[PDB]
Amino acid sequence: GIAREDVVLNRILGEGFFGEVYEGVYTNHKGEKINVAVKTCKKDCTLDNKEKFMSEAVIMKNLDHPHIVKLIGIIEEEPTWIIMELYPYGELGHYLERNKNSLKVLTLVLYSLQICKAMAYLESINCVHRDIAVRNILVASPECVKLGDFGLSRDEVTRLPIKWMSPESINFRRFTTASDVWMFAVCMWEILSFGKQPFFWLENKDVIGVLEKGDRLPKPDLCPPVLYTLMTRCWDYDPSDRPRFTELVCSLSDVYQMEKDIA
Ligand SMILES: COc1ccc(-c2cc(NC(=O)Nc3cc(C(C)(C)C)nn3-c3ccc(C)cc3)[nH]n2)c(C)c1
C-alpha cells in the first residue's frame, strides 16, 4: 500500500549501498504521524541490483519480532522507496555513551537478553546476521532495543568488522550461527562497557595474533562476573564449544533474574 503523498522527506539520515537514506514522516489513515527512514535506489542500477534492493522489503514484511526493526511499507512505483520505522533515540552505542551516568546494570543485561531473543529467532530459521554490533541496534524506547542489519557490508579487503569477528571468520571467511554467537558476545562487551569499541587499543591486523595466543577482551568494570563467564564461552576458539543462541537465552534470563533480585 502507502501513497507517496502520505510521506514527507525531511533530512538525509545517511548513505546506503543502493542510495541515500532519508529521515521522514508518514501520515496514516487516522492522521497519526509516524517517524520513518526512507531507503532509496539509484535509477541506473542493474535489474539484478534493483531486485536485491526490493528483496529487503519482500523479506522484512515477514518479520514481526519485538526485538527486530519494523518495516512500515513499500512504494513500488519509480522512485521505489522502502519505508522503515524510525527509532529517534538512534543507535544503542551512541545512546549508551550519552546516558552512562544514569543507566543501571540490570538495563544493560535486559538489552543483551532482548538481542539474544532476536538472534535465537534467526537461529531457528538457520539465518546468520554476520554484523552483530551495537551500531546495528536501535533504541525504540529505554525499555526496548531492536536489532537491524544496515551496515555497508551486507537472507544470509576490510570493509569487514575484524574486531568483532570469530577466528574462523577472520582466517577463512567462514560465517555460521556459531560465529554470530562470538560476535554477539563482543556486542555484549560493547553494551557493558557503555559503547566502547572492542580492541580500540589495537590495529585490525593485530587482532588475529592476540586471539590465537589466547588473549580476550577484559571484563568491563560493571559487568557481573557470571555474565563475563558466558561471554568467554561465546569466545571459545572452537565453534562447537560456543552455546547456541536458544540456550544462551536461558543463561541470560538466569543472569537477569539474579541481577533483578540484588537490585
Ligand atoms: C534511526 O532509525 C532507524 C530505523 C531503521 C533503520 C534501518 C533498518 C534497515 N534494514 C534492516 O535492518 N534490514 C534487515 C534486518 C535484518 C535482520 C532480521 C535483523 C537480520 N535483516 N535485514 C535485511 C537487510 C537486507 C536484506 C536484503 C534482507 C534483510 N535499514 N535501515 C535505520 C538505519 C535507522
JSON list of C-alpha atoms in Angstrom, two decimals, residues 16-139:
[
{"chain": "A", "resi": 16, "resn": "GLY", "atom": "CA", "xyz": [23.08, 3.19, 1.93]},
{"chain": "A", "resi": 17, "resn": "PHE", "atom": "CA", "xyz": [24.59, 0.73, -0.59]},
{"chain": "A", "resi": 18, "resn": "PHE", "atom": "CA", "xyz": [21.83, 1.39, -3.21]},
{"chain": "A", "resi": 19, "resn": "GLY", "atom": "CA", "xyz": [21.28, 5.11, -2.49]},
{"chain": "A", "resi": 20, "resn": "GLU", "atom": "CA", "xyz": [20.64, 7.80, 0.15]},
{"chain": "A", "resi": 21, "resn": "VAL", "atom": "CA", "xyz": [18.50, 7.09, 3.21]},
{"chain": "A", "resi": 22, "resn": "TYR", "atom": "CA", "xyz": [16.21, 9.91, 4.40]},
{"chain": "A", "resi": 23, "resn": "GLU", "atom": "CA", "xyz": [14.51, 10.75, 7.69]},
{"chain": "A", "resi": 24, "resn": "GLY", "atom": "CA", "xyz": [10.81, 11.29, 7.02]},
{"chain": "A", "resi": 25, "resn": "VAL", "atom": "CA", "xyz": [7.23, 11.46, 8.33]},
{"chain": "A", "resi": 26, "resn": "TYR", "atom": "CA", "xyz": [4.50, 9.04, 7.29]},
{"chain": "A", "resi": 27, "resn": "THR", "atom": "CA", "xyz": [0.87, 10.15, 7.95]},
{"chain": "A", "resi": 28, "resn": "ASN", "atom": "CA", "xyz": [-1.57, 7.22, 8.17]},
{"chain": "A", "resi": 29, "resn": "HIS", "atom": "CA", "xyz": [-5.41, 6.90, 7.72]},
{"chain": "A", "resi": 30, "resn": "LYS", "atom": "CA", "xyz": [-6.06, 8.19, 11.32]},
{"chain": "A", "resi": 31, "resn": "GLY", "atom": "CA", "xyz": [-3.84, 11.24, 10.65]},
{"chain": "A", "resi": 32, "resn": "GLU", "atom": "CA", "xyz": [-1.20, 9.86, 13.06]},
{"chain": "A", "resi": 33, "resn": "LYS", "atom": "CA", "xyz": [2.38, 10.94, 12.24]},
{"chain": "A", "resi": 34, "resn": "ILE", "atom": "CA", "xyz": [4.91, 8.08, 12.17]},
{"chain": "A", "resi": 35, "resn": "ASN", "atom": "CA", "xyz": [8.67, 8.90, 12.01]},
{"chain": "A", "resi": 36, "resn": "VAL", "atom": "CA", "xyz": [10.27, 6.87, 9.16]},
{"chain": "A", "resi": 37, "resn": "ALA", "atom": "CA", "xyz": [13.63, 6.01, 7.45]},
{"chain": "A", "resi": 38, "resn": "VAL", "atom": "CA", "xyz": [13.13, 6.15, 3.64]},
{"chain": "A", "resi": 39, "resn": "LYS", "atom": "CA", "xyz": [15.54, 3.96, 1.66]},
{"chain": "A", "resi": 40, "resn": "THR", "atom": "CA", "xyz": [16.15, 4.88, -2.00]},
{"chain": "A", "resi": 41, "resn": "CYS", "atom": "CA", "xyz": [17.73, 3.12, -5.02]},
{"chain": "A", "resi": 42, "resn": "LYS", "atom": "CA", "xyz": [19.78, 4.71, -7.87]},
{"chain": "A", "resi": 43, "resn": "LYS", "atom": "CA", "xyz": [17.73, 4.76, -11.13]},
{"chain": "A", "resi": 44, "resn": "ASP", "atom": "CA", "xyz": [20.65, 3.47, -13.32]},
{"chain": "A", "resi": 45, "resn": "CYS", "atom": "CA", "xyz": [21.15, 0.23, -11.28]},
{"chain": "A", "resi": 46, "resn": "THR", "atom": "CA", "xyz": [21.10, -3.23, -12.97]},
{"chain": "A", "resi": 47, "resn": "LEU", "atom": "CA", "xyz": [17.81, -5.27, -12.80]},
{"chain": "A", "resi": 48, "resn": "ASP", "atom": "CA", "xyz": [19.71, -7.71, -10.50]},
{"chain": "A", "resi": 49, "resn": "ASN", "atom": "CA", "xyz": [20.58, -4.85, -8.07]},
{"chain": "A", "resi": 50, "resn": "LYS", "atom": "CA", "xyz": [17.02, -3.35, -8.22]},
{"chain": "A", "resi": 51, "resn": "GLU", "atom": "CA", "xyz": [15.80, -6.92, -7.31]},
{"chain": "A", "resi": 52, "resn": "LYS", "atom": "CA", "xyz": [18.30, -7.16, -4.39]},
{"chain": "A", "resi": 53, "resn": "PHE", "atom": "CA", "xyz": [17.19, -3.70, -3.11]},
{"chain": "A", "resi": 54, "resn": "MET", "atom": "CA", "xyz": [13.46, -4.67, -3.28]},
{"chain": "A", "resi": 55, "resn": "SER", "atom": "CA", "xyz": [14.18, -8.09, -1.71]},
{"chain": "A", "resi": 56, "resn": "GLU", "atom": "CA", "xyz": [14.68, -6.28, 1.64]},
{"chain": "A", "resi": 57, "resn": "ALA", "atom": "CA", "xyz": [11.02, -5.15, 1.67]},
{"chain": "A", "resi": 58, "resn": "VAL", "atom": "CA", "xyz": [9.74, -8.59, 0.45]},
{"chain": "A", "resi": 59, "resn": "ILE", "atom": "CA", "xyz": [11.73, -10.29, 3.32]},
{"chain": "A", "resi": 60, "resn": "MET", "atom": "CA", "xyz": [11.24, -7.68, 6.12]},
{"chain": "A", "resi": 61, "resn": "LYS", "atom": "CA", "xyz": [7.43, -7.67, 5.77]},
{"chain": "A", "resi": 62, "resn": "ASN", "atom": "CA", "xyz": [7.54, -11.24, 7.24]},
{"chain": "A", "resi": 63, "resn": "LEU", "atom": "CA", "xyz": [9.43, -10.13, 10.38]},
{"chain": "A", "resi": 64, "resn": "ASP", "atom": "CA", "xyz": [7.22, -9.21, 13.36]},
{"chain": "A", "resi": 65, "resn": "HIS", "atom": "CA", "xyz": [9.59, -9.79, 16.29]},
{"chain": "A", "resi": 66, "resn": "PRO", "atom": "CA", "xyz": [9.54, -7.27, 19.24]},
{"chain": "A", "resi": 67, "resn": "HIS", "atom": "CA", "xyz": [13.39, -7.00, 19.05]},
{"chain": "A", "resi": 68, "resn": "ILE", "atom": "CA", "xyz": [13.84, -6.73, 15.29]},
{"chain": "A", "resi": 69, "resn": "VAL", "atom": "CA", "xyz": [13.44, -3.46, 13.26]},
{"chain": "A", "resi": 70, "resn": "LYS", "atom": "CA", "xyz": [9.98, -2.96, 11.69]},
{"chain": "A", "resi": 71, "resn": "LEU", "atom": "CA", "xyz": [9.08, -2.34, 8.01]},
{"chain": "A", "resi": 72, "resn": "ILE", "atom": "CA", "xyz": [6.22, 0.18, 7.57]},
{"chain": "A", "resi": 73, "resn": "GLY", "atom": "CA", "xyz": [5.79, -0.05, 3.81]},
{"chain": "A", "resi": 74, "resn": "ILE", "atom": "CA", "xyz": [6.99, -0.04, 0.22]},
{"chain": "A", "resi": 75, "resn": "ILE", "atom": "CA", "xyz": [6.18, 2.32, -2.68]},
{"chain": "A", "resi": 76, "resn": "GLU", "atom": "CA", "xyz": [6.96, 0.13, -5.75]},
{"chain": "A", "resi": 77, "resn": "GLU", "atom": "CA", "xyz": [6.48, 2.84, -8.47]},
{"chain": "A", "resi": 78, "resn": "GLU", "atom": "CA", "xyz": [9.63, 4.80, -9.54]},
{"chain": "A", "resi": 79, "resn": "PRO", "atom": "CA", "xyz": [11.29, 6.23, -7.45]},
{"chain": "A", "resi": 80, "resn": "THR", "atom": "CA", "xyz": [10.97, 2.98, -5.43]},
{"chain": "A", "resi": 81, "resn": "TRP", "atom": "CA", "xyz": [11.10, 3.65, -1.64]},
{"chain": "A", "resi": 82, "resn": "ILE", "atom": "CA", "xyz": [11.42, 1.21, 1.30]},
{"chain": "A", "resi": 83, "resn": "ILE", "atom": "CA", "xyz": [9.84, 2.79, 4.41]},
{"chain": "A", "resi": 84, "resn": "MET", "atom": "CA", "xyz": [11.28, 1.54, 7.74]},
{"chain": "A", "resi": 85, "resn": "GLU", "atom": "CA", "xyz": [10.01, 2.63, 11.16]},
{"chain": "A", "resi": 86, "resn": "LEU", "atom": "CA", "xyz": [12.44, 5.23, 12.59]},
{"chain": "A", "resi": 87, "resn": "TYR", "atom": "CA", "xyz": [13.64, 4.97, 16.18]},
{"chain": "A", "resi": 88, "resn": "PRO", "atom": "CA", "xyz": [14.54, 8.62, 17.11]},
{"chain": "A", "resi": 89, "resn": "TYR", "atom": "CA", "xyz": [16.72, 7.57, 20.13]},
{"chain": "A", "resi": 90, "resn": "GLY", "atom": "CA", "xyz": [19.09, 6.20, 17.42]},
{"chain": "A", "resi": 91, "resn": "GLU", "atom": "CA", "xyz": [21.86, 3.58, 17.73]},
{"chain": "A", "resi": 92, "resn": "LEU", "atom": "CA", "xyz": [22.40, 1.87, 21.09]},
{"chain": "A", "resi": 93, "resn": "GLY", "atom": "CA", "xyz": [26.18, 2.61, 21.25]},
{"chain": "A", "resi": 94, "resn": "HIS", "atom": "CA", "xyz": [25.69, 6.39, 20.98]},
{"chain": "A", "resi": 95, "resn": "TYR", "atom": "CA", "xyz": [22.67, 6.14, 23.35]},
{"chain": "A", "resi": 96, "resn": "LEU", "atom": "CA", "xyz": [24.83, 4.28, 25.96]},
{"chain": "A", "resi": 97, "resn": "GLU", "atom": "CA", "xyz": [27.60, 6.94, 25.59]},
{"chain": "A", "resi": 98, "resn": "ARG", "atom": "CA", "xyz": [25.09, 9.80, 26.27]},
{"chain": "A", "resi": 99, "resn": "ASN", "atom": "CA", "xyz": [23.35, 8.10, 29.26]},
{"chain": "A", "resi": 100, "resn": "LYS", "atom": "CA", "xyz": [26.33, 6.40, 31.01]},
{"chain": "A", "resi": 101, "resn": "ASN", "atom": "CA", "xyz": [25.73, 8.23, 34.35]},
{"chain": "A", "resi": 102, "resn": "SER", "atom": "CA", "xyz": [22.04, 7.11, 34.63]},
{"chain": "A", "resi": 103, "resn": "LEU", "atom": "CA", "xyz": [21.99, 3.53, 33.22]},
{"chain": "A", "resi": 104, "resn": "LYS", "atom": "CA", "xyz": [21.79, 0.59, 35.65]},
{"chain": "A", "resi": 105, "resn": "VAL", "atom": "CA", "xyz": [23.48, -2.80, 35.02]},
{"chain": "A", "resi": 106, "resn": "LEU", "atom": "CA", "xyz": [20.03, -4.53, 35.02]},
{"chain": "A", "resi": 107, "resn": "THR", "atom": "CA", "xyz": [19.08, -2.41, 31.93]},
{"chain": "A", "resi": 108, "resn": "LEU", "atom": "CA", "xyz": [22.33, -3.45, 30.15]},
{"chain": "A", "resi": 109, "resn": "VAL", "atom": "CA", "xyz": [21.58, -7.14, 30.88]},
{"chain": "A", "resi": 110, "resn": "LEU", "atom": "CA", "xyz": [17.98, -6.52, 29.62]},
{"chain": "A", "resi": 111, "resn": "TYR", "atom": "CA", "xyz": [19.23, -5.16, 26.27]},
{"chain": "A", "resi": 112, "resn": "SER", "atom": "CA", "xyz": [21.63, -8.15, 25.87]},
{"chain": "A", "resi": 113, "resn": "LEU", "atom": "CA", "xyz": [18.72, -10.59, 26.54]},
{"chain": "A", "resi": 114, "resn": "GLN", "atom": "CA", "xyz": [16.42, -8.78, 24.03]},
{"chain": "A", "resi": 115, "resn": "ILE", "atom": "CA", "xyz": [19.08, -9.06, 21.24]},
{"chain": "A", "resi": 116, "resn": "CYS", "atom": "CA", "xyz": [19.74, -12.69, 22.18]},
{"chain": "A", "resi": 117, "resn": "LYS", "atom": "CA", "xyz": [15.99, -13.42, 21.75]},
{"chain": "A", "resi": 118, "resn": "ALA", "atom": "CA", "xyz": [16.08, -11.79, 18.25]},
{"chain": "A", "resi": 119, "resn": "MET", "atom": "CA", "xyz": [19.14, -13.94, 17.36]},
{"chain": "A", "resi": 120, "resn": "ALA", "atom": "CA", "xyz": [17.51, -17.13, 18.78]},
{"chain": "A", "resi": 121, "resn": "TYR", "atom": "CA", "xyz": [14.67, -16.49, 16.26]},
{"chain": "A", "resi": 122, "resn": "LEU", "atom": "CA", "xyz": [17.19, -16.06, 13.35]},
{"chain": "A", "resi": 123, "resn": "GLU", "atom": "CA", "xyz": [18.99, -19.23, 14.53]},
{"chain": "A", "resi": 124, "resn": "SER", "atom": "CA", "xyz": [15.67, -21.19, 14.34]},
{"chain": "A", "resi": 125, "resn": "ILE", "atom": "CA", "xyz": [15.48, -20.41, 10.59]},
{"chain": "A", "resi": 126, "resn": "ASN", "atom": "CA", "xyz": [19.26, -21.11, 10.06]},
{"chain": "A", "resi": 127, "resn": "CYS", "atom": "CA", "xyz": [19.96, -17.45, 9.14]},
{"chain": "A", "resi": 128, "resn": "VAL", "atom": "CA", "xyz": [23.19, -15.66, 10.03]},
{"chain": "A", "resi": 129, "resn": "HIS", "atom": "CA", "xyz": [23.43, -11.93, 10.83]},
{"chain": "A", "resi": 130, "resn": "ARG", "atom": "CA", "xyz": [27.28, -11.60, 10.31]},
{"chain": "A", "resi": 131, "resn": "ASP", "atom": "CA", "xyz": [27.49, -7.99, 11.57]},
{"chain": "A", "resi": 132, "resn": "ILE", "atom": "CA", "xyz": [26.35, -8.08, 15.23]},
{"chain": "A", "resi": 133, "resn": "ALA", "atom": "CA", "xyz": [27.50, -4.81, 16.82]},
{"chain": "A", "resi": 134, "resn": "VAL", "atom": "CA", "xyz": [25.99, -2.03, 18.93]},
{"chain": "A", "resi": 135, "resn": "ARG", "atom": "CA", "xyz": [25.87, 0.23, 15.79]},
{"chain": "A", "resi": 136, "resn": "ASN", "atom": "CA", "xyz": [23.25, -2.23, 14.26]},
{"chain": "A", "resi": 137, "resn": "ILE", "atom": "CA", "xyz": [20.97, -1.96, 17.33]},
{"chain": "A", "resi": 138, "resn": "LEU", "atom": "CA", "xyz": [18.38, 0.81, 17.69]},
{"chain": "A", "resi": 139, "resn": "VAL", "atom": "CA", "xyz": [16.71, 2.10, 20.84]}
]
